[PDB]
Design a protein around this ligand. Structure first.
Ligand SMILES: CCC[C@@H](CCO)Nc1nc(N)nc2cnn(Cc3ccc(CNC4CCOCC4)cc3OC)c12
Ligand SMILES: CCC[C@@H](CCO)Nc1nc(N)nc2cnn(Cc3ccc(CNC4CCOCC4)cc3OC)c12
Ligand SMILES: *[C@@H]1O[C@H](CO)[C@@H](O[C@@H]2O[C@H](CO)[C@@H](O)[C@H](O)[C@H]2NC(C)=O)[C@H](O)[C@H]1NC(C)=O
Ligand SMILES: *[C@@H]1O[C@H](CO)[C@@H](O[C@@H]2O[C@H](CO)[C@@H](O)[C@H](O)[C@H]2NC(C)=O)[C@H](O)[C@H]1NC(C)=O
Ligand SMILES: *[C@@H]1O[C@H](CO)[C@@H](O[C@@H]2O[C@H](CO)[C@@H](O)[C@H](O)[C@H]2NC(C)=O)[C@H](O)[C@H]1NC(C)=O
Ligand SMILES: *[C@@H]1O[C@H](CO)[C@@H](O)[C@H](O)[C@H]1NC(C)=O
Ligand SMILES: *[C@@H]1O[C@H](CO)[C@@H](O)[C@H](O)[C@H]1NC(C)=O
Ligand SMILES: *[C@@H]1O[C@H](CO)[C@@H](O)[C@H](O)[C@H]1NC(C)=O
Ligand SMILES: *[C@@H]1O[C@H](CO)[C@@H](O)[C@H](O)[C@H]1NC(C)=O
Ligand SMILES: *[C@@H]1O[C@H](CO)[C@@H](O)[C@H](O)[C@H]1NC(C)=O
Ligand SMILES: *[C@@H]1O[C@H](CO)[C@@H](O)[C@H](O)[C@H]1NC(C)=O
Ligand SMILES: *[C@@H]1O[C@H](CO)[C@@H](O)[C@H](O)[C@H]1NC(C)=O
Ligand SMILES: *[C@@H]1O[C@H](CO)[C@@H](O)[C@H](O)[C@H]1NC(C)=O
Ligand SMILES: *[C@@H]1O[C@H](CO)[C@@H](O)[C@H](O)[C@H]1NC(C)=O
Ligand SMILES: *[C@@H]1O[C@H](CO)[C@@H](O)[C@H](O)[C@H]1NC(C)=O
Ligand SMILES: *[C@@H]1O[C@H](CO)[C@@H](O)[C@H](O)[C@H]1NC(C)=O
Ligand SMILES: *[C@@H]1O[C@H](CO)[C@@H](O)[C@H](O)[C@H]1NC(C)=O
Lengths: 772, 772
């Protein structure tokens, strides 16, 4: 046990490897810099707090600092919290940083700062001033920043943080910063490319601005430049989910043909949402090392059919030409240029939102000999007609995405339509070849549909209109298939011979296929699992299963079954003993999720009819009012038990008398008010205990023995109704001097009383009066 | 040992017998009321602090308070500290006390208060407002104080705290205080007796004021009155050591003959310094229960010879008639009235400063039959001639004081001449009959001087001019004598037969008789102790003894010897081995004080030549630079060792190996910088350790075993040079969590560094950084 309790409301970590003393005070509702931070502290984080000022006294002793993270302490109105708004901007007093000799990184994002903090140490390499109110950069301001390498000045003038004027940058403002490597000026209302920039630059971000034209001499000296982003300058504002204003007369970002002549070392060129109509081949005359080219959200639908520029990119790896569609035009077919065959290196190709009625083998002919091609993304294209057998010339490919289409007989939810994807805050693919057909209109399936696709390892048929009775003669060609996602469909389990043709299948997802289970008298064959000789994981979540024609599910291979969101309460209706041995015959089963099954009580015989090798069992979100803990004696292999979000008021008299196997117990979000006299007594196998978010008042030494407690990896106690009287004298002392990992010890492990101590942390408590 | 360290800078005590939670913060340099005082607190003391205000928030939780001691927090300029002066008077905000339902006592003395604190609880019994600036009492102000029993309003307008006006009291101001028992108005510039006072009063103090006359009806209703003080009204200002102003024309305090007619229950009447010339017998017509009458500092020298009033006082116990002398008259003899014989009850009689040349048996004749008489004080009388054989008619008497006179062949230093002896802040007699002849002019003594005084048990001849060679034939009659104080004389130890005639003597004090020891070649016989067969204690302090004709002191009875302030360094001069066994032959000796003997080093053989039963040994204030601890193996009965105020730098490697008996070790005010690796290891007999006022930086677990430390009754560590680094991690934790009585833990047990911790108490320290 500890000699001195850790009273500091910050997570202190030690990294002797790099001699870093990391102090983390992220979102600890601070109003002052916490007193008593180690002198040997190097990395200090104070994000999402309410510290109103930074005076020299702030970092006084800690002269060993190398990083200061003072982000979002006064986050702008439109970007930050409306319940707890910032009253006055962060006040940085002079000589606050100049003393910190060893400082290398300084983050001051979202603090409503009016100017570049002067008096900074010459050791600084990184300076972040994002989301502040600095929209006038002058040469005098950056004189102190001589040694800076990475500079973030972005988000200082945009729709979420306006300045109502254009961004101003002095002539040759960044020119004397002879060590500058990274420069971000994103989301700033910048009208023209700041010049002259230092030749030492390698990354340049000028996206989401007022730049309407590029000069030929704009990047004449940036020979060392590797990444350049000129996106959101003359944007394609159609269906934009953010205030978007395009260049007058819908004009594109005017770039001279010889503008990228100096950028020999350029690898990434992002030209997303620039209203571009033509891509001149002359652009890439001297860039033979380009690997990533983002040409999404432009008007290059006609240019895709020509694309003479592709001949100058034989080293290109990534090509994004998404949402280049001409509105009012619903194309019959996709015109792909024969030039796409000259992309000898290309691994990733993305052509979403081209918009066309029909997909044919002939259309994809220029890609037929692209040896390195791994990904083909043709999603959100409204393709009505497509013959899947055409992808036999694409066996080498890892992912063939056709998600969100209208075919009938991993990137984020918002990727191409978000203002800034790289904005800062405060999956079956592994199995092999994947064909994504999710969110389509396939209403009926047959063996002939998957002809020649024997090679597939994963197939996604989620969100289709398959309202069929499968007899195991629908996916006959897919012999190699290991994963099938059949979620969000209308599966009809009339036959127990369903899915049996997929003889190599390891993962089956039949979740959210509730339609037929939601109607009375319909035959449901859940014993279909028996024929799947290699099935490892099965998901039948949110299916509303209240009836079953088969009394048992059979399997000699299955290890994981997700049965969350069904009606086991109806299958297990007290008096009805027919479905109590339902999961008993899934012999190799180790994991069983029977959460969200409306089980207010578990009928006697559920524990006896459990598979022999069950390890992890969840009964979470069931509204369980009563539980017979003693019955866990049947679950002889049990290690984990999730009983979170229930109505349980009492723990067992002796946990060791219930299970000798049980390691991790979860009892969070219940109604427990008091633990039993000798609860955890003699339960030496226990390694994890969550008792957080309950109504517990007192915890005694008998209920929580030290020999049992000191072997726990983590003990969760936060959000309880703790009474800090003289009877809680053991608990207060134990919690303070323990080595056991108690999370939120200085934010949610607090007293509800008596009076004097109401709303005070138990860690800060001093019950010396109980000792006089 | 403790679970929660006591961090509060106040001495917290618990007396479950009276249910009092006593919190004492006397002189703890406080500027705010210390946070975290027990809620169960009843008695709270905050004297000699710098708390500038009292707001309702002050005693918020502690509603169980019965006593509040908020004295001297703003003590007036002339009365308080000049280095740390009070800037602005104590500010008592409204409703600060009204909430404290159970409050009984409230002390607000010396806070420069301008008015009576309003809004006080109706439960209050005692209110103290001494040394404030309240010199105008109005009826409206005391309406809240309905239930008050004891009231202190004194020292609000005197020479140390002026108000430059007369004290004002409304007509019938205290009349409605129907429960008032005590009322002090001392040192207040009061011109007339406040009337009408409540009949319920028992104690009245009106001393040191401007009262020139008493009215007959002034005490007409105070039938219950027990004590009345009217002193310092028309004072005797001759030789006054304070600004004294007497009544015009040196007039006495005019008291009507019938003024004390209502005071039947009066027991104490103090009329000190009232310039009185005649005491009318009519005063005591109805007071037959009076026991204490103070008539000192008046002009009753002629009245002492008449004293017709003494016939009305046959129940009187104490009679003080000191300093009544007439300036310009050095009387031939003391004229005592034959009326003194009517004082059948009198135990104490004091007649100092009558000023007379000669004392004779005949003069004291009225006291010859006073059966109860115990004390006769005839000091500071300038008596030139007196025959001590006259006190044979005073064998019954306990004390016959003749101290400070000019005879030649317990009260304080300032008692009769101090402004206020009862002012508030922020001895052989036990042996039997005593004759005090100290501070006289006796130059020669003989057996005939003490003729008939065989009965005496204690004789004080301190501070006389006895420059004699005693041969043991000077005090032959004093056979019963058990104590002789012969200090401050010029004893000449030419004969070893000195003092031998006092065959029943237990205590002899020959201290400060340095005269002859301060001159070379003179014979000194210290072996004179041998003939005193019952001597228990001997004091020969500050005698400057550097030589002795006798090499050894012999005694079979002596148990205590004080040899402080001599020159043992010269007697024990390295090379001179003659006086090393000096104290060896005092066999029954248990205590030996050899402090202040200029012993920078102890010569080898001093320990071997020590009496066999020595228990307590002081070597304090010697300037001891080096000590051979191992040599304590000779002192086989030693329990206490005082080595305070020396130049010692090191402790022994193992204290347990130096003595087997040592219980209490004192090492305060030394130069110790570090303790030995296993200092207190196995020292099971140790119970007291004073390591205070040294230069110790660190203390380790090995030096202070937990097994030895618990046996310690008290451990003194304060005023040391403690370094609060990570090496002091054990010491900081031990001190915080120990039950061992460590005094000044929150005022002098503090860090000298490193930087961050400089001037911080070790009890408040949190070295959690040393644990990460
Ligand atoms: C009203 C609900 C009754 C159950 C009874 C199934 O024994 N029917 C059905 N349940 C489900 N889940 N889906 C469908 C879809 N069509 N049908 C009707 C149906 C189909 C086939 C057969 C069985 N025919 C076989 C019998 C053996 O020789 C070969 C033909 C009988 C049917 O209804 C009685 C369904
Ligand atoms: C110069 C210092 C020498 C010492 C020597 C003492 O053996 N004398 C004296 N020391 C002290 N402390 N005080 C006095 C006061 N008078 N005398 C002189 C004195 C007195 C008596 C005797 C001894 N007479 C006794 C001896 C025994 O048969 C009967 C006569 C001798 C003296 O000086 C030599 C003193
Ligand atoms: C502590 O702060 C340092 C300096 O700010 C961080 O160092 C960076 O570490 C990454 C690798 O983790 C490197 O790629 C960067 O180049 C380093 N930056 C500098 C300026 O040296 C470090 O990661 C921080 N550690 C934690 C846990 O916050
Ligand atoms: C970007 O800069 C333009 C100016 O170039 C800002 O537009 C002005 O806004 C004010 C207040 O809304 C108007 O009164 C002016 O007429 C506008 N001028 C022009 C030329 O349009 C614009 O507000 C800035 N953007 C942001 C987000 O602050
Ligand atoms: C006691 O009251 C008297 C008033 O009766 C004060 O005496 C006055 O003092 C002021 C200032 O020292 C003088 O201007 C007056 O002339 C004084 N008057 C008289 C009649 O003495 C006296 O100062 C008060 N005593 C104290 C201790 O404050
Ligand atoms: C593709 O588009 C180009 C124009 O961009 C056109 O000349 C060509 O004929 C088209 N090819 C096909 C097969 O549609
Ligand atoms: C789909 O293409 C394959 C050849 O890849 C062909 O055998 C099959 O008949 C086609 N399907 C239809 C419905 O035309
Ligand atoms: C199948 O596609 C859907 C999107 O329609 C997605 O939610 C799911 O995660 C995909 N399946 C796999 C195995 O990743
Ligand atoms: C399965 O159903 C198909 C029609 O979907 C039918 O042609 C086939 O004969 C059926 N096979 C069996 C074994 O039921
Ligand atoms: C499934 O369920 C019933 C028996 O309960 C039976 O009709 C059917 O043939 C069983 N099939 C398998 C695969 O066990
Ligand atoms: C505590 O306060 C009460 C009331 O004033 C008093 O009678 C008692 O003697 C006090 N005791 C101490 C130790 O202060
Ligand atoms: C004592 O004094 C009184 C006067 O006070 C006087 O009458 C009397 O004779 C004196 N007696 C003696 C003995 O001095
Ligand atoms: C002292 O008084 C006594 C009687 O008390 C007497 O015998 C003796 O002679 C007196 N002595 C002197 C020196 O006056
Ligand atoms: C003897 O009188 C003196 C005062 O002259 C005093 O210091 C000493 O304490 C008295 N002796 C005793 C035994 O009290
Ligand atoms: C003691 O001293 C006295 C006084 O000086 C003297 O009369 C007597 O003879 C001395 N006796 C001896 C034996 O010294
Ligand atoms: C004191 O010692 C001296 C010699 O040192 C001797 O003459 C004298 O008689 C001794 N007295 C006693 C009482 O021992
Ligand atoms: C001191 O220690 C030594 C060695 O440990 C031992 O021989 C000796 O007797 C000890 N002496 C005492 C007084 O304890």
């Amino acid at each position: 046990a500890r000699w001195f309790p850790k009273t500091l409301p910050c997570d202190v970590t030690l990294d002797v490897s790099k001699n870093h003393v990391i102090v983390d005070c992220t979102d600890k509702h601070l109003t002052e810099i916490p007193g008593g931070i180690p002198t040997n502290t190097t990395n200090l984080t104070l994000t999402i707090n309410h510290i109103p000022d930074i005076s020299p006294a702030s970092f006084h002793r800690l002269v060993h600092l190398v990083e200061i993270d003072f982000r979002c302490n006064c986050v702008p109105i439109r970007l930050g919290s409306k319940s707890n708004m910032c009253p006055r901007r962060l006040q940085i007093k002079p000589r606050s940083f100049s003393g910190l000799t060893y400082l290398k990184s300084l983050y001051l994002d979202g603090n409503q700062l009016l100017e570049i903090p002067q008096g900074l140490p010459p050791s600084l390499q990184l300076l972040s001033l994002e989301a502040n109110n600095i929209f006038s950069i002058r040469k005098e301001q950056l004189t102190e920043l001589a040694n800076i390498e990475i500079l973030y000045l972005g988000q200082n003038c945009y729709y979420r943080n306006p300045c109502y004027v254009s961004y101003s940058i002095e002539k040759d403002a960044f020119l004397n910063l002879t060590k500058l490597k990274v420069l971000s000026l994103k989301d700033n209302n910048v009208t023209t490319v700041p010049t002259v920039l230092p030749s030492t630059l390698t990354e340049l971000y000028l996206y989401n601005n007022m730049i309407a034209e590029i000069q030929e001499d704009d990047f004449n000296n940036l020979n060392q430049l590797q990444i350049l982003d000129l996106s959101g300058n003359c944007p394609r504002c159609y269906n934009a989910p953010f205030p978007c204003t395009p260049c007058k007369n819908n004009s594109p970002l005017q770039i001279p043909v010889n503008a990228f002549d100096a950028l020999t070392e350029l690898k990434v060129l992002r030209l997303h949402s620039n209203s571009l109509q033509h891509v001149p081949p002359r652009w890439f005359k001297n860039i033979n090392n380009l690997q990533e080219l983002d040409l999404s959200q432009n008007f290059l639908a006609k240019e895709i059919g020509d694309a003479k520029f592709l001949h100058f990119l034989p080293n290109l790896i990534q090509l994004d030409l998404s949402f280049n569609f001409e509105l009012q035009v619903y194309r019959a077919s996709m015109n792909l240029s024969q030039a796409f065959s000259s992309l000898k290196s290309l691994k990733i190709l993305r052509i979403r939102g081209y918009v066309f009625k029909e997909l044919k083998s002939f259309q994809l002919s220029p890609l037929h000999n692209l040896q390195n091609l791994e990904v083909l993304d043709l999603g959100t294209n409204f393709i009505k007609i497509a013959n899947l057998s055409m992808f036999k010339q694409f066996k080498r490919l890892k992912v063939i995405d056709l998600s969100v289409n209208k075919i009938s007989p991993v990137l984020e939810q918002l990727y191409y339509f978000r203002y800034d994807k790289y904005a800062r805050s405060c999956s079956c693919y592994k199995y092999g070849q994947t064909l994504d057909l999710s969110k389509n209109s396939i209403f009926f399936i047959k063996s002939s549909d998957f002809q020649h696709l024997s090679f597939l390892k994963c197939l996604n048929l989620s969100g289709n209109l398959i309202s069929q009775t499968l007899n195991g003669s629908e996916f006959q060609p897919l012999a190699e298939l290991r994963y099938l996602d059949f979620s969000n469909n209308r599966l009809d389990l009339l036959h127990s011979t369903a899915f049996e043709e997929l003889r190599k299948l390891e993962v089956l997802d039949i979740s959210s296929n509730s339609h037929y289970f939601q109607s009375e008298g319909i035959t449901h064959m859940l014993n279909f699992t028996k024929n799947l000789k290699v099935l490892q994981k099965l998901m039948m979540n949110d299916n509303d299963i209240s009836s079953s024609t088969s009394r048992t599910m059979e399997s000699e291979s299955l290890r994981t079954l997700e049965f969350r969101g069904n009606h086991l309460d109806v299958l297990w209706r007290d008096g009805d003993n027919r479905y109590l041995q339902l999961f008993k015959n899934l012999l190799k089963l180790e994991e069983l999720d029977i959460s969200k099954n409306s089980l207010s009580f578990l009928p006697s015989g559920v524990f006896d009819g459990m598979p022999p090798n069950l390890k992890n069992l969840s009964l979470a979100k069931n509204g369980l009012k009563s539980f017979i803990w003693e019955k866990l004696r049947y679950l002889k292999n049990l290690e984990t038990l999730d009983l979170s979000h229930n109505q349980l008021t009492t723990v067992p008299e002796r946990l060791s008398n219930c299970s000798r196997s049980l390691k991790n117990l979860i009892l969070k979000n219940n109604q427990i008010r008091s633990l039993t006299k000798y609860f955890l007594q003699d339960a030496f196998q226990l390694r994890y205990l969550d008792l957080s978010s309950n109504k517990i008042q007192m915890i005694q030494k008998t209920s929580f023995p030290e020999n049992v407690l000191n072997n726990l990896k983590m003990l969760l106690l936060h959000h309880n109704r703790f009474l800090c009287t003289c009877d809680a004298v053991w608990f207060v002392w134990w919690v303070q001097h323990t080595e056991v990992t108690i999370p939120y010890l200085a934010t949610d492990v607090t007293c509800v009383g008596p009076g004097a101590h109401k709303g005070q942390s138990v860690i800060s408590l001093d019950l010396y009066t109980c000792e006089l």
